[PDB]
Ligand binder design. Structure first.
Ligand SMILES: Nc1ncnc2c1ncn2[C@@H]1O[C@H](COP(=O)(O)OP(=O)(O)O)[C@@H](O)[C@H]1O
Ligand SMILES: Nc1ncnc2c1ncn2[C@@H]1O[C@H](COP(=O)(O)OP(=O)(O)O)[C@@H](O)[C@H]1O
Ligand SMILES: Nc1ncnc2c1ncn2[C@@H]1O[C@H](COP(=O)(O)OP(=O)(O)O)[C@@H](O)[C@H]1O
Ligand SMILES: O=C[C@@H](O)COP(=O)(O)O
Ligand SMILES: O=C[C@@H](O)COP(=O)(O)O
Ligand SMILES: O=C[C@@H](O)COP(=O)(O)O
Ligand SMILES: [Zn+2]
Ligand SMILES: [Zn+2]
Ligand SMILES: [Zn+2]
Ligand SMILES: [Zn+2]
Lengths: 489, 161, 489, 489
């Protein structure tokens, strides 16, 4: 018997199959196109996530040799914010999906600020005025289609996030539900009142009609034919969970397409005064918990950038090897605001920049610099995290794909002057959904059944260069401040 | 609302008004490339509204990405350049709208780009709309009409090749 | 019968052999190491220029089949500013050569400004306070060697620039002479008084003892055994000359390691009020003339950078091909202040930066951006040139190695909104020395003998994109302003 | 009103939409994974062609803005030989698709020869004993699955080629048909008798049960829901057709993943005595015609090889540019038998080799050599073609993706000493299906309606180097002979 998780990510779609004993049994990854139709814009193709996510399932099931008969449930994990609209009848999109990075609805945010909602939005969404979240991507869509708003009041138009879209495409049109995690992200939902905001909805000109049903992050949403789908949670949160976040002051950092740093704040909605997000996570039964989050748009992406456009490396894996051929970035800094600055900057205007170049700088300085950006950003977010929550981390639990980089790991450690604990199973975001699934299905009963698959594989501790950290960071600080406000309006 | 559907009145080289308004001396364009005919020669036009159109049956060459200008090659080996306003490229495509495509043949009159004469009216630096012949080298004589013109109707220039 | 020119450049050393009819007969190039011992620093190895320059001679002579018997004279052309000191007895350097780019003596300049010499230095050198010129590189040397100053008062220590060094190493120690062109560059010499400045010399703590003999840019300096050496002029100037600069308001732009834009101002020392240099060139007989100069440190270098460190291209030639695969830099800008900013910025603090990056930007955006920097800089310099001299160019005569780039050429043209005339023989800097040599030797008698080898090979004229130029340049302007002041003090 | 063609190729899947006037209106390409599970083996994933082919349709339809309402019919084109088996009930494969290149069933062929069927197989299939065709790939499958043969006699097991598979997956399981073109390829079908061979079937242990229905290359096979599917023909043949092959002695060469050279032999099954294939094509109404075919496994693939594994180029387009930076391969030869040698060698044992290397040879020699292999092979095939058919071509009509390579085109021309006519629309293989579709649907009535969209865009004629051709080819000949028989048995 086994659960099966679905991780549909920015970069790609995956499918993990675990046993009761919670062992990774078989996996399937399949990467998918990234479209930039214009600069600061990012978009993915609904049918492609779809095709890719689906396809990934089969292939896992197949790979292991397993059928409808032996799978307890389906756990679902997705990329956040990324808005989608689709004609109910058809199962067809009225547009492309707007991704969380895409800076398009930037002017809109500018109105929102012009009006006076910063305060409001903060307080009820826990979010912050920025193209990062669902809201504006919705309005921007409705706004750039003739028969939209009206077509949607009549309600032939569906909204949703990846989990919602992923679900409905499986419950053959039956189910229209998002989870609690997902919803907080949207900028339309109220975290205290725990329901859609009438104001947002209005102000934004959104129609309650498209909004799905909002439900617990562990519940049986329904059944599907590969069978029930018991789990749903925004990716970052499903990883908080798989790390066994779950308790106050508990925290992790996920290194993937982006970087997400979260801390469980039990049942208290801590109000960030330091460029951070107040949002929802889970407590041990999949119940609603609050939390502090630091979002950083670019991490692993950069590597992909060097890898795929710049063409300096064949594999991201190689970055360790070259970055280590150098000892120093030789003065260079890489601010990867390829799609604005997130926490705690939140400047959809800044753009990527490179600095401190001189004739002797080469490819390897550059790569490494990219790797460095990672820890810098991380560190930015962290200091915020601390100030906000008054707590001082002693270790950083981490996970993500980039976390296999001894170099980065370590460097991360030095630059923080803190130990870094790297978990033995990197594929945690998955694990999270599973539990939420399993649990919800009596597949497990107790989290405790599992304070055991969470072996630490490695500890990174501060080397002697940790003394140098302040200088190096000031570097960073100056660089950043120069990439800001690049675009115009 | 639009007669676009209805039938219109239908009447050496003659170049036709590709947009409408009052004709102007290249010489008065608030940009040198124009004013000194560095880019070539022709006239300009203060515009009256709504749209830019083929001024020769030829083939649309390039169309500016921010769709504020375009060129085209006449079946008669003439080169036309139409640049809407000046420094328009800073509006980044706002007011503009692409009716045709970077490759087709056209007759006179076919819609090429549509526009928003008023958004453009206070946003843009100037609204002058130069119409110049770029390949001034392969042309013997070039003449400049005057006064008022109307799209795909009144001609602005006549030229001997 | 024939003259032979020597072009010893930043990047490499060359040897051209021309006939009376002034035809390029045989050439020899040999590139040489570039050392960056530290960031903003550049240095070359005296023995290597030396070895490389020498070696280049033979090989040309050999290549064509020619001897001591058929060569009328030796014309000499060198890279400017680059300071050298060497024990007289030995023929050995007390250091490495400091190159014109090397920002080392930057603090020194800072004293100079602190003291009040900006005004003075301007007015008598026509130069401007900046590590760019000889002066400070000399003092910095004397300052970082025990037995120096004193060893040099006793005068066992020789100073010189490449021409001076190149000469002495040929006139077996006999001759110690620099030309008029060379000397202006040093920051120690007085352009009106046409002789070494007592003040500079003092202030800088330099000893008249090391200074060579300063002589006409056409004169027989002496004889050497491959025979006489009749010509000498700083590279930029020898190209002004080969273009037949020679008359008031006449101008060229040289595209090589750097970019140098000069205009002959006959006999009048125009005072730049726009970030430009007042310096010396030649009038038709090799006589002293004045001139306005715009120096831009990085041009062809950048290409080499992409080519050699970044590793994006195998040949600089290839840049055309890739840059053209793209239509736009896609928002990107490259400010190549790898070794500070020159005219008219003159900020030894700025460093290379890249901007406007987003996920969709790739290698080709980047290359092209580098190519673009070229014309931008050019254009910066030009506008200055115009304001200063009140004249409006109608064409730009050009030359240099990079000038074989149709793309860049053209783009240069569009971006200026001016025609660009590209001469049929690109190797003009050479030609210049020759004439100065030949002439001085009765090899030619009259410049007029030659208002004929100066065929124009091509004209670039402003395409329709020339309308777009202002926007594009504003891009540039913002980018620049952000790379400034990067380093600290 | 319009037809829509489907081209499902070795490399990728496509979707073309044409108008009545036969103009390419909108296209969709989507590349798909290539698996080599072992050396001389190639395999594709049924669900991926599937997913990719499907997905491509929508996107074309969508792109143009068009619905079920305006499309006259569906024309279908596929890659040949590539065998597939699938559980009838399910719509699931019992394996991966074996591709035409895959040398797996090589021993099997060895039995076939051992037995005495060379003669037979030749005479009735017109094919030749080689892993290239369907037959053996089928048996190899049935042979490496427990419940297969039997499961298939009971007939829960389906066989098919891409057209057959592509169809059935659209006619929701309804239709099981292959066309005449497709079938000849299989090694199971009899070209005279125009029906399945009882012998082959036996000998190979294949069960009539899986074989589909075999029908005209223009007929309405059925209806599908995007509507009827009126066309089917093996790719090479659909291009013969779009070139308006159609008459005796008429010929084309297609340059794609492989190279296929075919000549219409009207109604006469010419017996190849020169390493060629006797197979079926169409006559003007989509009726059965015979033809001579020369298959060459590797062409465009090689480029992909340099492009994707070797990593020498970013785009195949670039090959022109680099190959032209060189004048000669500098002695080098590339025999691209990556997956054996086809016509007229047919040696599933040879493997890729490179020759004539010396220290001065670099990347560009190599690329170009790869490009050259193309014309060599072409030429090999051609000479065969001529001998066999007693006719001497005067021009070569061509088409394919690689045909955009001026260099290769030309070089092809020189090396043949024959003109080369390059058609103005390269996407002919598509066009072919369409007609077969349209025609069959009264969409067109007469081929004649179209001896007009077939404009020649360019003519390549023999340059002066054509004199050198014999030497150069002998090069080739020696190289080839050395790559042969590499693997063992
Ligand atoms: N050795 C490595 N060093 C750096 N980045 C790595 C390395 N291995 C994988 N990656 C990066 O890790 C990322 C994958 O992160 P993961 O958590 O799987 O994906 P996702 O972005 O979908 O959440 C990519 O952005 C990739 O470019
Ligand atoms: N096609 C080209 N495009 C760009 N730069 C070129 C090209 N060909 C040569 N170069 C560049 O031209 C320069 C050579 O300039 P030149 O005037 O010979 O040398 P120098 O710097 O010694 O004065 C180099 O900096 C090189 O990188
Ligand atoms: N300029 C070019 N030179 C060489 N090969 C090219 C070029 N452009 C495309 N290709 C090659 O053409 C092929 C595409 O051929 P085509 O007829 O479309 O595809 P298929 O193999 O599916 O039949 C590829 O094998 C590719 O590697
Ligand atoms: O806010 C978006 C997050 O879900 C990012 O997750 P991801 O890195 O896996 O795409
Ligand atoms: O100021 C230094 C100049 O001589 C530069 O000349 P160069 O580009 O040939 O090295
Ligand atoms: O024999 C196989 C042929 O169909 C090859 O066609 P292809 O090059 O398009 O894959
Ligand atoms: Zn993920
Ligand atoms: Zn413009
Ligand atoms: Zn030079
Ligand atoms: Zn094909």
């Amino acid at each position: 018997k086994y659960i099966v998780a679905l991780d549909q990510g920015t970069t790609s779609s995956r499918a993990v199959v675990m046993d009761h004993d919670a062992n990774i049994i078989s996996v399937s990854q399949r990467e998918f196109e990234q479209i930039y139709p214009k600069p600061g814009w990012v978009e993915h193709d609904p049918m492609e996530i779809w095709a890719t996510q689906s396809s990934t399932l089969v292939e896992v099931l197949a790979k292991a040799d397993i059928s409808s008969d032996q799978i307890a449930a389906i756990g679902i994990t997705n990329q956040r914010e990324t808005t989608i609209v689709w004609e109910k009848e058809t199962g067809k999109p009225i547009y492309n999906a707007i991704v969380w990075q895409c800076r398009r609805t930037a002017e809109i945010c500018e109105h929102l600020k012009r009006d006076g909602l910063e305060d409001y939005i903060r307080s009820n969404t826990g979010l912050v005025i920025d193209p990062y979240f669902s809201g504006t991507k919705v309005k921007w869509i409705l706004d750039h289609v003739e028969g939209s708003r009206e077509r949607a009041r009549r309600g032939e138009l569906l909204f949703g996030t990846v989990d919602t879209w992923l679900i409905w495409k499986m419950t053959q049109g039956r189910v229209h539900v998002t989870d609690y995690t997902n919803a907080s992200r949207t900028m339309l939902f109220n975290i205290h009142t725990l329901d859609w905001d009438d104001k947002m909805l209005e102000v934004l000109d959104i129609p309650r009609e498209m909004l799905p049903e909002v439900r617990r992050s562990s519940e049986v949403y329904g059944q599907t034919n590969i069978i029930p789908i018991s789990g749903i949670a925004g990716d970052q949160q499903a990883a908080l969970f798989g790390q066994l976040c779950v308790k106050e002051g508990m925290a992790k950092n996920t290194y993937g397409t982006g970087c997400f740093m979260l801390m469980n704040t039990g049942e208290k909605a801590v109000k960030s005064e330091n460029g951070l997000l107040t949002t929802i996570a889970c407590g041990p039964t999949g119940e609603v918990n609050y939390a502090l989050e630091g979002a950083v748009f670019m991490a692993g992406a950069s590597i992909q950038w060097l890898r795929d456009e710049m063409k300096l490396i064949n594999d991201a894996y190689d970055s360790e090897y070259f970055a280590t051929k150098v000892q120093n970035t030789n003065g260079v800094y890489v601010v990867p605001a390829f799609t604005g600055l997130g926490a705690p900057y939140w400047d959809p205007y800044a753009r990527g920049a490179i600095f401190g170049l001189t004739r002797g700088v080469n490819a390897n300085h550059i790569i490494r610099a990219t790797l460095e950006s990672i820890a810098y950003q991380t560190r930015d977010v962290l200091e915020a995290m601390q100030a906000d929550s008054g707590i001082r981390l002693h270790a950083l639990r981490v996970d993500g794909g980039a976390v296999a980089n001894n170099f980065l790991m370590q460097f991360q450690s030095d630059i923080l002057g803190t130990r870094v604990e790297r978990p033995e199973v990197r594929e945690v975001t998955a694990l999270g959904a599973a539990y939420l699934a399993g649990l919800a299905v009596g597949f497990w009963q107790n989290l405790d059944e599992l304070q055991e698959k969470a072996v630490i594989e490695r500890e990174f501790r501060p080397g002697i260069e940790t003394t140098e950290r302040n200088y190096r960071y000031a570097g960073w600080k100056k660089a950043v401040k120069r990439a800001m406000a690049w675009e115009e309006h | 609302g639009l007669f676009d559907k209805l039938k219109s009145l239908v009447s050496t080289i003659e170049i036709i008004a590709p947009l409408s308004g009052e004709i102007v001396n290249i010489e008065d364009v608030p940009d040198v490339v124009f004013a000194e005919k560095i880019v070539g020669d022709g006239i300009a036009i203060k515009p009256t509204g709504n749209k830019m159109v083929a001024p020769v049956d030829g083939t649309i060459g390039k169309i500016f990405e921010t769709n504020h200008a375009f060129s085209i090659e006449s079946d008669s080996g003439v080169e036309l350049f139409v640049h809407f306003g000046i420094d328009t490229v800073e509006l980044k495509g706002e007011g503009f709208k692409r009716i045709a495509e970077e490759g087709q043949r056209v007759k006179v009159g076919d819609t090429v780009i549509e526009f928003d004469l008023p958004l453009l009216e206070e946003k843009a630096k100037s609204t002058l709309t130069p119409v110049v012949i770029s390949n001034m080298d392969e042309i013997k004589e070039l003449i400049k009409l005057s006064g008022s013109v109307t799209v795909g109707e009144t001609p602005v220039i006549r030229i001997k090749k």
